[PDB]
């Protein structure tokens, strides 16, 4: 797409290791075309990463020309031993040597010489009649991996450029899978020297692909795919997008230079975190960048951290997000204070993403074997009464307030277990809708307290007598403390199941049940119509 990619230069510094300096020498023959090149033999020079041929164009001078216009008269160059003026059927005789012979490139249809135009160190290359005295060139053969990578670069560039712009979907899929297999890291069980050799080759190929602008090409392909997908075929499109993210991750994994180059697209990468299908690949690419490139941590802003935290909030509890945040906090033993402060201020105080921990007291419930029911045509009395004396309570025994609640529980669903449960555990009377409890200050039902006024209100302390009254007819539940009535009650609850007195507590309490008769004399007079609970016992029971 660049208009000046067809010009030819003598460049020094880094250009001798790239894939743009690679030319194929192609003799003008089909049989024995892999044989020795002689002095004065015609050939074409093909540029590997573009596919163009060195030529004497009609309008301009020395230039790269398309293959469709590269006739023999335009593209014909020979190596001469000096500027001092057959096709045999075999391997021939070796004449031109790598690294030793000094070759003068001469155009054949014109007789001109490949010279440099007289002026970084970047000389324009022209064709001149006379030339200079240092026009000679030295040939150096490249490795097989470099030339293979350069041809793969040309083919992939052509395919992705026609994809960015019917479209060869299967060719794109096969190319993406082949490229992902091409940048595959060596297995961990490999021998150390072979593993290091394969890592060296992989790093060289990653550098070669980065130097030809393949990362930017993959980014433009991803942008074009997102534009197409925003506006089956959709399954193929999302598969190609997933393979593109895998290719990007494989291209930048383990290479510091590629990640440092890619750190400029941090806003783009963070902004593409909203989508469900693209989230895992973006997260993998981001983690590779944060592990390798150290300046990407400097480039991280507050909005990026909030986007990552919102990804954690909207996608579930994934620990790879936590790994990304950990990588954001430290890089190679250096702590970034801004990232630490932003993570602490935007992740911790909400207390709804991370699992919480605490130390809680264990709570147990104790009941007498007194069960009260309501049924049609039943010989069961409906008004019942009992009392509880608190001999000793030690609040803050275990740095947590001592649980102590007393009341009525229904056998329909009141099944407290020690340990976990609803809320923060420690489930007692009033922590579900089957128990109705009093703690001295509040009324508890459904694990929701309601503060209720009373004469000299306080928590259940020592020498306190709590009287509980249950009227199953209405139904209603009322409490009294030291004879003083508590100004609150429970009503309109389910009368199914059996009702029993219950006390729930943590450690550090001493209480006594009084049910009347020979099972505890009441310290206060029961209300009118309310029977003591000991009358509910069967005659053949204790």
């Amino acid at each position: 797409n660049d208009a000046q990619h067809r010009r030819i230069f003598y460049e020094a510094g880094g250009a001798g290791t790239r894939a743009r300096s690679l030319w194929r020498v192609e003799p003008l023959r089909i049989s024995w075309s892999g044989s020795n090149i002689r002095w004065g033999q015609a050939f074409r020079l093909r540029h590997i990463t573009t596919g163009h041929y060195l030529a004497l164009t009609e309008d301009q001078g020395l230039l790269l020309q398309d293959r469709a216009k590269s006739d023999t008269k335009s593209t014909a160059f020979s190596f001469r031993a000096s500027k001092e003026i057959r096709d045999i059927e075999g391997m021939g005789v070796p004449e031109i040597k790598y690294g030793d012979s000094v070759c003068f490139v001469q155009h054949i249809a014109s007789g001109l010489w490949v010279t440099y135009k007289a002026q970084p160190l970047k000389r324009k290359v022209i064709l001149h009649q006379e030339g200079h005295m240092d026009d000679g060139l030295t040939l150096q053969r490249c490795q097989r991996e470099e030339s293979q990578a350069a041809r793969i670069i040309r083919n992939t560039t052509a395919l992705f450029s026609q994809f960015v712009s019917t479209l060869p979907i299967q060719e794109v899929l096969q190319t993406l899978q082949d490229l992902i297999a091409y940048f595959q890291p060596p297995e961990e069980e490999m021998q150390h020297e072979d593993k290091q050799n394969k890592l060296r080759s992989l790093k060289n190929r990653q550098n070669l692909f980065k130097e030809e602008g393949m990362l930017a090409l993959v980014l433009n392909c991803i942008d074009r795919l997102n534009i197409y997908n925003s506006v089956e075929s959709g399954m193929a499109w999302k598969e190609i997008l997933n393979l593109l993210y895998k290719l990007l991750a494989a291209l930048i994994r383990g290479n510091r230079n590629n990640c440092a180059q890619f750190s400029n697209n941090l806003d783009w990468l963070i902004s593409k975190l909203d989508r469900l299908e693209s989230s895992s690949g973006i997260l993998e690419v981001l983690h590779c960048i944060l592990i390798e490139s150290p300046e990407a941590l400097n480039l991280i802003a507050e909005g990026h951290i909030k986007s990552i935290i919102s990804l954690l909030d909207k996608h579930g509890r994934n620990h790879k997000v936590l790994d990304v945040l950990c990588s954001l906090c430290l890089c190679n033993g250096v702590a970034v204070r801004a990232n630490q402060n932003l993570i602490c201020d935007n992740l911790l105080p909400r207390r709804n993403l991370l699992l919480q921990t605490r130390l809680i007291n264990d709570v147990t419930s104790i009941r007498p074997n007194i069960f009260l029911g309501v049924a049609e045509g039943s010989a069961q009395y409906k008004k019942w009464y009992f009392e509880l004396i608190i001999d000793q309570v030690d609040p803050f025994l275990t740095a947590e307030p001592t649980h102590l609640r007393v009341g009525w529980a229904s056998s329909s669903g009141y099944a407290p277990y020690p340990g976990g449960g609803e809320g923060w555990g420690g489930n007692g009377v009033g922590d579900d809708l089957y128990s109705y409890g009093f703690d001295g200050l509040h009324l508890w039902s459904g694990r929701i307290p309601r503060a209720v006024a009373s004469i000299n209100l306080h928590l259940l302390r020592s020498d306190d007598v709590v009287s509980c009254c249950l009227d199953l007819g209405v139904p209603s539940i009322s409490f009294r403390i030291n004879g003083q009535p508590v100004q609150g009650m429970f009503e309109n609850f389910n009368t199914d199941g059996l009702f029993f007195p219950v006390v729930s507590f943590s450690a550090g309490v001493k209480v006594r049940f009084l049910t009347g008769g020979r099972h505890g004399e009441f310290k206060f007079l029961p209300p009118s119509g309310y029977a003591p609970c000991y009358e509910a016992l069967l005659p053949k029971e204790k």
């Binding site: 690294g99 150390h192 020297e193 290091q196 060296r200 790093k203």
Partner: protein, 316 residues
């Protein structure tokens, strides 16, 4: 006390028989594995420096025929103790991993290679050549060329500044006096190692140091030696022309001259080891080089300094 009791008995304890590798083999393999890891730069490793120093000290420990033969057998046993545990390959790997940059690790690596190669140990030479031809390690020769190109010659400007400072009544430190010909011990060690590779007319290594067949790149070590010899000869000519018009030579000039002559003697011995046997390829490489210009300059310096120094009794 510290210059005598340091690392006094650790090497026999490491190899003392009570894992198939012994502890010394394990630490050598650890250093080899660190050297083989692909890195951009050889980072500083004090552990390698200390252990390679103690290995080189372990190897380096008239007369009758029996006494000389027992000394040779003792040296062979001490070198076998190290090279049967992979020390020669480790030396080559550390030289390759230096990337042509001088460091204390390079210094101790060359000293250890000299210690295991001393006396022209043919087994160590065979192991080193087998490793270099099996692995096709062009980085070793690239690093050798880079290390040879960074060797220093006589510095006349630094000598003049030192003389001015000494004339202004200032006592010069050792580091200041070691700036005229800096790191000459490293230069002598490098060319001694290159000489010991070819010792005994080992024609395979003699041909391999010239052209490395099978490798991607080829470095001609002989021509690099000639290039450093030419630079050193030019520096010695400059020093002579500094001292040509003076009746006497002071102690600093004699000290720097002695250092330069020691380095030149090592380089001449290295070239003689390259070409003896004879090696036709190395002889033709030396003939088509810049050796003759160095010979002409050295002949000029030899004649004039011979006539100059014969006339005084303080320059014997």
């Amino acid at each position: 006390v510290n210059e005598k009791t340091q690392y006094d008995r650790l090497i026999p304890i490491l190899m003392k028989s009570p894992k198939q590798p012994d502890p010394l083999h394990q630490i050598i393999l650890h250093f080899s594995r660190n050297a083989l890891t692909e890195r951009s730069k050889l980072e500083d490793d004090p552990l390698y420096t200390s252990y390679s120093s103690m290995m080189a000290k372990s190897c380096q420990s008239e007369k009758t025929f029996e006494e000389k033969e027992m000394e040779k057998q003792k040296t062979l046993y001490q070198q076998a103790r190290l090279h049967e545990r992979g020390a020669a390959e480790m030396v080559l790997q550390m030289i390759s991993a230096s990337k042509g940059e001088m460091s204390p690790m390079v210094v101790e690596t060359l000293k250890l290679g000299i210690a295991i190669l001393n006396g022209g140990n043919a087994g160590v030479q065979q192991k080193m050549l087998d490793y270099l031809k099996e692995k096709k390690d062009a980085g070793f020769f690239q690093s050798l060329s880079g290390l040879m190109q960074s060797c220093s010659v006589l510095d006349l400007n630094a000598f003049e500044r030192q003389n001015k400072a000494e004339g202004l009544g200032m006592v010069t430190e050792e580091g200041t006096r070691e700036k005229v010909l800096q790191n000459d011990e490293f230069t002598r060690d490098l060319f001694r190692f290159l000489q010991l590779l070819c010792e005994g007319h080992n024609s395979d290594f003699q041909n391999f140091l010239r052209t490395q067949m099978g490798n991607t790149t080829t470095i001609n070590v002989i021509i690099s030696t000639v290039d450093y010899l030419l630079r050193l000869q030019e520096s010695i000519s400059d020093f002579y022309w500094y001292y040509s018009g003076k009746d006497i030579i002071d102690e600093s000039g004699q000290h720097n001259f002695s250092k330069a002559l020691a380095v030149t003697k090592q380089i001449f011995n290295s070239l003689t080891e390259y070409i003896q046997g004879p090696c036709i390829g190395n002889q033709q490489s030396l003939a088509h080089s810049r050796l003759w210009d160095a010979v002409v300059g050295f002949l000029h310096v030899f004649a004039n300094m011979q006539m100059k120094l014969s006339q005084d009794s303080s320059q014997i």
